[PDB]
Design a binder for this molecule. Structure first.
Ligand code: CHL
Ligand code: CLA
Ligand code: CLA
Ligand code: CLA
Ligand SMILES: CCCCCCCCCCCCCCCCCCCC(=O)O[C@H](COC(=O)CCCCCCCCCCCCCC)COP(=O)(O)OCCN
Ligand SMILES: CCCCCCCCCCCCCCCCCCCC(=O)O[C@H](COC(=O)CCCCCCCCCCCCCC)COP(=O)(O)OCCN
Ligand SMILES: CC1=C(/C=C/C(C)=C/C=C/C(C)=C/C=C/C=C(C)/C=C/C=C(C)/C=C/C2=C(C)C(=O)[C@@H](O)CC2(C)C)C(C)(C)C[C@H](O)C1=O
Ligand SMILES: CC1=C(/C=C/C(C)=C/C=C/C(C)=C/C=C/C=C(C)/C=C/C=C(C)/C=C/C2=C(C)C(=O)[C@@H](O)CC2(C)C)C(C)(C)C[C@H](O)C1=O
Ligand SMILES: CC1=C[C@H](O)CC(C)(C)[C@H]1/C=C/C(C)=C/C=C/C(C)=C/C=C/C=C(C)/C=C/C=C(C)/C=C/C1=C(C)C[C@H](O)CC1(C)C
Ligand SMILES: CC1=C[C@H](O)CC(C)(C)[C@H]1/C=C/C(C)=C/C=C/C(C)=C/C=C/C=C(C)/C=C/C=C(C)/C=C/C1=C(C)C[C@H](O)CC1(C)C
Ligand SMILES: CC1=C[C@H](O)CC(C)(C)[C@H]1/C=C/C(C)=C/C=C/C(C)=C/C=C/C=C(C)/C=C/C=C(C)/C=C/C1=C(C)C[C@H](O)CC1(C)C
Ligand SMILES: CC1=C(/C=C/C(C)=C/C=C/C(C)=C/C=C/C=C(C)/C=C/C=C(C)/C=C/C2=C(C)CCCC2(C)C)C(C)(C)CCC1
Ligand SMILES: CC(=O)/C=C/C=C(C)/C=C/[C@H]1[C@H](C)CCCC1(C)C
Lengths: 41, 99, 165, 192, 73, 219, 192
């Protein structure tokens, strides 16, 4: 189990997971808050 | 408007008087501090440029203050420039004031 | 009006653009049923287009002769005419998030640089440490200013390698 | 030193024995001794010139002859200058020529002397002989008065460039309503 | 007997506090002795002037009937 | 050392220990690792807490009196505008500049005190009043002129307790002011109005129903 | 000492031999000797100025010549300043300049003297020469009268800023209805 978690912590796996999480978060932000041209607060 | 003879003469006389009795000390001090142009540590004449030798008709003059003829021409040129600037500006009859 | 720009609310080109886009969408919608999947998708697109145009006109954006929104990137000019959310506020937001990520990475690199084997820590990231440093990176402005005023944020020029000129 | 410009701070060591010194040098401009000497001479000269300018600006208005800003207007529009009411028979060209010559001679004589004589020449500029007796205190008084005059001259220029009035008029207007007539109320100083 | 000495002017352009180090000491000889330095300075100036000429001839036509010639401009 | 911590079971960071008032080992972001930075943050916390206490008092007490009937004052968000429309109302720009001018002098003096506590006690600085400007050794706690009644001067432990009470009240007031800002922005009503509306129906009147805290896009 | 301010308190030791000293210094403003000396001189000077001001305020009112608040009012909105029922031919500018020059000279000569002479200068300032022969009791009476006059002047200012009437009218109004005419009735002093 330790070796598996160590493999999941490698640079490529972590890079792909981080990019996927960031892309998913951005996609959902644009899905619920679309066409945000300016920062209207 | 302004008399060309009077303006030109007055400006030239004033420039010569300023360069002979007022600006002469600072001019001489600056000349001594600067000196002749040097290339690689020696003057142009010392390096081999014969045409760079200082003229002898300015090395020593009978004027007690050392006011050479070249000094006369330089100050007269400045005086004439100022005189003609005054004459030209006075000749125009337009409003250049920013008010 | 800032630089000869007309507000999108009173812009005729803006309204014409919205009308044309909705018209094209309805023309495409006319070739389907009333409750079919393509019809519902086209109706949703029409609603989104109308909402977008209404929001742009209501937010106070400035439109040019072409009828498209224009952004004002100048403090003072955008602050006095109510356009701070165009570039000013987004600039602050970016700078903050960018500094957060940069500070988290810097702290992780400096923390693993003291380990006996830092290269492995660079290829095999320490998830708990990275998570803690990512959380700590949110206070990056305060930490960065403190380190700058402390002198620990910089490396002495005499300690950095340089070329032989 | 007598002063500190900031009670809780450390002042530079090169500004300890100087007259009218408060240790004010946050930018460290006078770190070099040569620059410090030049700055001292220039400060005294600027203070004297500003004292004369402030006295003239206030006198021309108090006596009722006009403001400093409108003084050269009758000479540039197409007339003659006025001094105490009389008409001066000189134009812009002649005035500039005489002033240039006189100032050139005076400044050349002043700038061609020793460093101390260029700022404190009591040989003939002190007929009353006031220097031969506690000159440090008098020097401090002169420097402080010159500093105040410099600030006053800059204030006159900025105030006129912002509101367009004159020193006495500006002072009267501010005294009429200090809470609502100041730099914060004009639409120039504050970008509101 | 009158005029300036570029060497002295360069040697005098040394700001105090040593912000610029020695300043421009020895620059006169560095430029006079090296032909590549002079050629580089001349080329930089000439290129900038060429750009200035290009930017000024279209916005401020100096020749008659030049603005009407779209191909030539 | 063994004093109560913010999160029971979690050890306090070594950079905090237990000497500053209000020390509960709360620093998940490790902002106060540097001693100089920690000192500056301590002074900033004291200043923010005191100003927040004054503001929350000036916002709650007048509101409570107004609700009863005695002393009628406008709501805190409209108090600034109400005075603006007054007859002899001072211009906003001039008023702000005067306040900033006075605060410049006092705050700069306090700033010098932070760098060196006995800075303002320099002899000859003022007209004999500098003697009363010497701190107590810790920036942010200046006796002399301040603290005229001498509260907590009986012993060192008495002063420590008062410091803890001050820090807790300041933090509570800071959180309260942030709540006031958020409540007014979300609901255009006063704090007392919000409290009364919540008690009437807590499950139907809270931040989950104001329409601002929870975005309508998600629902 | 002759007094204790707070019957059971412990008065400071540096205020045990000074005249008219009750040990009142809870803030500890006179801990340093220099500050104590400056404050002593300032207190005596303030007491003298306050006694003179209170005497003038009461005299101008009991003599039916006007109030203290409206005294400079006729000068503004026109001109002409009345004195003893007569007329003075001076404007605000001349009056301010004259007062500034006279006060500047007097204070400059007073402030440049020795510390003791800056507060208790005998000789020419005591024409009757009653200073000799136990001046401690006289000094105590002077300080106490000055404190009372200071409080009276502050009372005049505060009362006028609250009610709006001058001293004599306020006194008569309070004497007429001592139960319903006081500081508690006006909507300024006691709010709740
Ligand atoms: C201690 C300070 C003091 C000051 C600042 C003033 C100031 C003033 N008093 Mg005054 N008084 C003072 C003390 C006293 N007054 C009076 C009795 C009066 C009266 C009865 C009147 C004034 C009036 C005035 C005003 C006339 C202007 C003026 O100076 O005319 C010029 C005054 C002088 C040149 C005085 C010269 C005195 C010198 C020859 C001895 C003025 C604002 C007048 C007023 O208010 O009119 C509207 C007025 O009628 N005062 C008494 C005696 C009780 C004072 C005792 O200390
Ligand atoms: C530097 C270049 C740049 C910049 C400044 C922008 C800026 C923007 N784009 Mg754009 N885009 C770009 C490049 C860029 N884009 C490129 C190269 C492409 C091709 C792939 C696109 C394709 C694209 C599309 C298809 C759309 C946008 C949209 C937007 C707007 C949406 C803002 C938002 O997401 O809401 C707010 C987001 C947040 C508040 C999240 C902030 C916090 C994050 C998670 C931090 C990230 C940390 C790492 C915004 C103004 C959308 C839009 O509506 O246009 C107006 C949209 O539909 N972009
Ligand atoms: C470079 C050689 C040179 C020399 C040596 C002179 C010398 C002289 N010029 Mg001349 N000038 C020159 C070049 C020169 N000029 C050039 C190139 C121009 C064309 C711009 C002029 C135009 C010019 C004008 C218009 C006048 C002179 C005048 C004079 C005389 C001035 C006398 C004087 O001070 O009046 C007397 C001094 C007072 C009254 C005081 C003087 C002898 C003036 C003249 O003729 O004198 C009357 C005069 O009016 N010059
Ligand atoms: C990045 C470069 C930049 C440029 C080209 C400008 C340009 C301009 N600014 Mg600006 N500004 C900038 C940066 C810049 N700013 C930054 C970084 C800030 C934040 C401190 C501001 C804050 C600011 C304010 C508050 C104002 C301007 C204003 C202006 C306009 C007139 C002021 C002026 O230039 O007069 C001369 C400038 C001198 C220094 C003299 C002008 C177009 C003014 C405006 O809005 O116009 C009405 C205005 O009041 N700016
Ligand atoms: C170095 C530059 C030269 C500086 C010279 C300054 C000293 C000489 C100045 C004399 C100038 C001069 O005489 O011209 C007058 C104008 O003055 C200047 O315009 C002409 O006087 P005017 O004839 O115009 O005045 C008629 C009134 N009767
Ligand atoms: C109401 C008007 C009251 C005006 C009273 C002014 C009296 C001023 C005299 C003060 C004085 O004598 O001090 C001298 C200062 O020495 C000196 O330097 C001489 C200064 C004297 C100036 C002349 C004053 C004339 C103007 C008076 C107008 C009336 C003596 O020396 P000291 O300092 O020890 O004082 C001890 C004096 N008992
Ligand atoms: C009567 C009159 C005229 C005027 C005549 C004169 C001659 C006026 C004089 C003007 C002067 C000479 C002003 C000087 C004006 C001088 C001024 C304004 C200089 C100010 C300097 C300041 C405030 C501080 C600097 C610094 C210090 C010292 C440090 O130590 C660093 O570390 C940091 C740092 C802060 C940068 C007229 C021509 C108008 C015509 C009218 O009809 C008349
Ligand atoms: C369980 C659990 C985890 C949870 C961690 C959380 C979550 C912590 C929460 C912090 C806060 C402070 C939450 C606030 C949580 C508060 C709220 C309110 C959350 C969601 C509510 C929504 C989305 C509804 C909105 C509506 C809409 C928009 C309407 O239209 C109107 O009708 C009104 C209304 C009905 C209100 C774990 C990680 C430990 C471990 C596992 O993974 C699991
Ligand atoms: C050298 C010698 C030596 C010998 O032996 C002796 C003898 C003779 C003594 C001598 C000489 C001397 C002299 C000359 C002196 C002079 C001085 C002066 C002039 C000063 C001024 C000086 C001056 C000055 C300070 C000035 C100042 C000013 C001011 C503050 C102003 C203010 C103001 C302003 C801003 C603005 C407003 O709206 C108004 C007012 C309010 C108005
Ligand atoms: C600790 C820590 C550490 C870790 O590591 C991290 C973290 C987590 C981040 C942290 C936390 C933090 C926090 C929480 C903060 C907050 C703060 C605040 C809230 C402040 C306020 C603060 C606040 C304040 C000052 C306030 C004040 C107020 C005032 C004055 C008021 C005023 C007023 C009045 C009277 C009345 C009128 O009519 C109006 C007005 C004008 C309005
Ligand atoms: C000691 C201590 C110590 C501890 O530790 C702390 C503490 C507590 C702080 C303390 C206390 C303090 C106090 C009590 C103070 C107060 C003061 C005052 C009140 C002053 C006044 C003061 C006052 C004063 C000078 C006054 C003056 C007056 C006058 C001139 C008047 C004038 C006049 C007249 C004649 C008339 C006319 O028609 C008008 C006039 C023109 C108006
Ligand atoms: C020896 C002698 C003497 C002296 C004399 C003299 C003083 C002479 C002179 C002379 C002169 C008198 C000189 C002058 C000179 C120079 C000149 C004269 C120049 C010039 C020119 C120019 C450079 C111009 C230019 C122009 C033109 C061409 C055009 C228009 C523009 C202008 C103006 C830029 C005596 C008696 C003392 C002593 C003994 C002997
Ligand atoms: C308003 C202004 O511009 C200057 C005012 C100066 C003063 C009060 C100086 C006063 C004295 C002090 C305290 C020290 C020695 C000299 C003085 C006259 C006794």
């Amino acid at each position: 189990m330790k070796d598996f978690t160590t493999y999941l912590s490698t640079a490529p796996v972590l890079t792909l997971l981080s990019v996927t999480v960031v892309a998913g978060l951005l996609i959902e932000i644009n899905r619920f808050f679309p066409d945000a041209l300016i920062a209207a607060f | 408007l302004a008399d060309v003879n009077l303006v030109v003469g007055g400006c030239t006389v004033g420039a010569l008087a300023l360069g002979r009795f007022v600006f002469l000390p600072f001019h001489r001090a600056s000349l001594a501090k600067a000196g002749m142009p040097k290339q690689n540590g020696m003057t142009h004449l010392q390096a081999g440029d014969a045409r760079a030798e200082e003229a002898s008709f300015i090395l020593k003059t009978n004027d007690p203050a050392g006011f050479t003829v070249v000094d006369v021409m330089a100050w007269g040129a400045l005086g004439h420039a100022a005189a003609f600037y005054i004459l030209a500006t006075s000749s125009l009859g337009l409003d250049r004031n920013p008010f | 009006d800032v630089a000869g720009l007309t507000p999108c609310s009173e812009s005729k080109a803006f309204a014409k653009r919205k009308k044309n886009e909705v018209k094209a969408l309805n023309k495409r919608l006319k070739n389907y049923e009333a409750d079919s999947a393509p019809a519902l998708a086209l109706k949703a697109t029409i609603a989104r287009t109308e909402a977008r145009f209404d929001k742009y006109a209501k937010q106070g954006l400035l439109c040019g002769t072409d009828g498209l929104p224009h952004l004002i990137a100048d403090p003072g000019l955008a602050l006095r005419y109510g356009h701070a959310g165009d570039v000013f506020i987004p600039t602050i937001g970016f700078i903050y998030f960018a500094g957060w990520l940069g500070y988290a990475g810097s702290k992780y690199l400096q923390a693993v640089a003291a380990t006996a084997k830092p290269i492995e820590k660079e290829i095999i990231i320490d998830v708990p440490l990275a998570w803690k440093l990512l959380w700590e990176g949110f206070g990056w402005p305060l930490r960065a200013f403190a380190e700058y005023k402390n002198g620990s944020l910089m490396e002495d020029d005499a300690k950095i390698t340089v070329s032989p000129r | 030193k007598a002063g500190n410009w900031l009670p809780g701070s450390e002042t530079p060591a090169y500004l300890e024995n100087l007259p009218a010194s408060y240790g004010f040098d946050p930018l460290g401009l006078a770190a070099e001794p040569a620059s410090l000497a030049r700055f001292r001479e220039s400060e005294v000269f600027h203070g004297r010139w500003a004292m004369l300018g402030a006295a003239g600006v206030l006198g021309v208005e108090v006596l009722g002859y006009g403001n400093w800003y409108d003084a050269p207007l009758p000479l540039v529009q197409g007339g003659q200058a006025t001094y105490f009411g009389a008409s001066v028979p000189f134009d812009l060209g002649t005035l500039a020529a005489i002033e240039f010559a006189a100032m050139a001679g005076a400044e050349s004589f002043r700038g061609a002397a020793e460093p101390e004589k260029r700022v404190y020449p009591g040989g003939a500029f002190d007929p009353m002989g006031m220097s031969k007796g506690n000159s440090k205190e008098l020097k401090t008084k002169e420097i402080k008065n010159g500093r105040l005059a410099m600030l006053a001259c800059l204030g006159f220029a900025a105030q006129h460039a912002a509101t367009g009035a004159s020193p006495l008029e500006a002072l009267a207007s501010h005294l009429a309503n200090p809470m609502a007539v100041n730099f914060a109320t004009n639409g120039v100083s504050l970008p509101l | 007997g009158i005029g300036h000495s570029m060497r002295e002017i360069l040697e005098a352009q040394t700001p105090p506090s040593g912000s610029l180090g020695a300043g421009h000491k020895g620059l006169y000889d560095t430029v006079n002795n090296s032909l590549h330095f002079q050629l580089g300075l001349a080329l930089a100036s000439v290129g900038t002037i060429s750009s200035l000429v290009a930017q000024h001839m279209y916005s401020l036509p100096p020749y008659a009937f030049l603005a009407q010639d779209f191909t030539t401009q | 050392a063994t004093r109560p911590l913010w999160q029971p079971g979690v050890e306090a960071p070594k950079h905090l220990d237990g000497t500053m008032p209000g020390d509960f080992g709360f620093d998940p972001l490790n902002l106060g690792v540097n001693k100089e930075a920690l000192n500056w943050y301590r002074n900033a916390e004291l200043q923010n807490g005191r100003w927040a206490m004054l503001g929350v008092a000036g916002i709650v007490i007048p509101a409570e009196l107004t609700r009863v009937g005695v002393l009628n004052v406008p709501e805190w968000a409209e108090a600034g505008k109400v005075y603006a429309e007054s007859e002899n109302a001072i211009p906003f720009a001039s008023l702000l500049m005067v306040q900033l001018f006075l605060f410049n002098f006092v705050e700069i003096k306090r700033w010098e005190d932070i760098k060196k506590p006995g800075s303002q006690a320099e002899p000859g600085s003022f007209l004999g009043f500098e003697s009363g400007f010497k701190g107590t050794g810790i920036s942010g706690y200046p006796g002399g002129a301040f603290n005229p009644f001498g509260l907590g001067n009986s012993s060192k432990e008495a002063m420590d307790d008062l410091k803890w009470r001050e820090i807790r009240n300041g933090r509570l007031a800071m959180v309260a002011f942030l709540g006031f800002l958020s409540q007014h922005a979300a609901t255009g009503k006063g704090p007392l109005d919000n409290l009364a509306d919540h008690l009437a129906d807590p499950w139907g009147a809270n931040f989950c129903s104001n329409g601002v805290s929870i975005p309508s896009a998600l629902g």
